[PDB]
């Protein structure tokens, strides 16, 4: 893991990518949570292929995924939606515009944040290679305050910088772009916490059935 070159790290993360799955207030939440549940199973496989992650104890793997799962779902959603201004591509057969968020109480605010993030991705011209690095950082960073993990995180930073150097950016441009990319992770954290609050509210209100797995992931956040 700490032995991989920058190019090997990129290759490994690209290879490890999950597939794109297919898809009233009750039915829309039903579709979204059903999708999320199926995506979660593939996320666990992806996590096992992030270099360094399988070195961790089972206990630590569980903790990192419990913390990060909705952040990871969201950054994937934002990435899929990049080339579709004003819309969220939940699945290729569920492309939802902003106003369909209104179909669910409290959802349009979250739709708006996700759309703004996608808009930010566009204005930065975020690349696929950068995206997979960022998703890996989310997995390893979000629950980490709760040394070898920090070494792996440093390697992914190295890999991001390598990609920017390869793309012809000056040293000054590399550092500025690295910062811009990492600052978006603060926004993704914000969105996940709001989304978690929303999902918990929907569960309490019995508006939708949730899978055993989802219920477990949700209750990890108390």
């Amino acid at each position: 893991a700490l032995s991989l070159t920058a190019d090997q790290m990129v290759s490994a993360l690209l290879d490890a990518e999950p597939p794109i799955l297919y898809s009233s207030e009750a039915s829309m939440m039903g579709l979204l949570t059903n999708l999320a549940d199926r995506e979660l199973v593939h996320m666990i496989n992806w996590a096992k292929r992030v270099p360094g992650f399988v070195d961790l104890t089972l206990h630590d793997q569980v903790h990192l995924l419990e913390c990060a799962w909705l952040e990871i779902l969201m950054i994937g959603l934002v990435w899929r939606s990049m080339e579709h201004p004003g819309k969220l591509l939940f699945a290729p057969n569920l492309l939802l515009d902003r106003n369909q968020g209104k179909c669910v109480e409290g959802m349009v605010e979250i739709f708006d944040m996700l759309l703004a993030t996608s808009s930010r991705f566009r204005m930065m011209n975020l690349q696929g290679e950068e995206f997979v690095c960022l998703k890996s950082i989310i997995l390893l960073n979000s629950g980490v305050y709760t040394d070898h993990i920090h070494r792996v995180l440093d390697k992914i930073t190295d890999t991001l910088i390598h990609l920017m150097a390869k793309a012809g950016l000056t040293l000054q441009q590399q550092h500025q772009r690295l910062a811009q990319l990492l600052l978006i992770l603060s926004h993704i954290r914000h969105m996940s916490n709001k989304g978690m609050e929303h999902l918990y509210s929907m569960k309490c209100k019995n508006v939708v059935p949730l899978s055993d797995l989802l219920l477990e992931m949700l209750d990890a956040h108390r």
């Binding site: 199973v41 666990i44 496989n45 096992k48 089972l58 793997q61 569980v62 995924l65 419990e66 055993d212 797995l213 477990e216 992931m217």
Partner: peptide, 10 residues
């Protein structure tokens, strides 16, 4: 948790 099993069986 199912999470544990998924990780193990993955």
């Amino acid at each position: 948790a199912i999470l544990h099993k998924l990780l193990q069986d993955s």
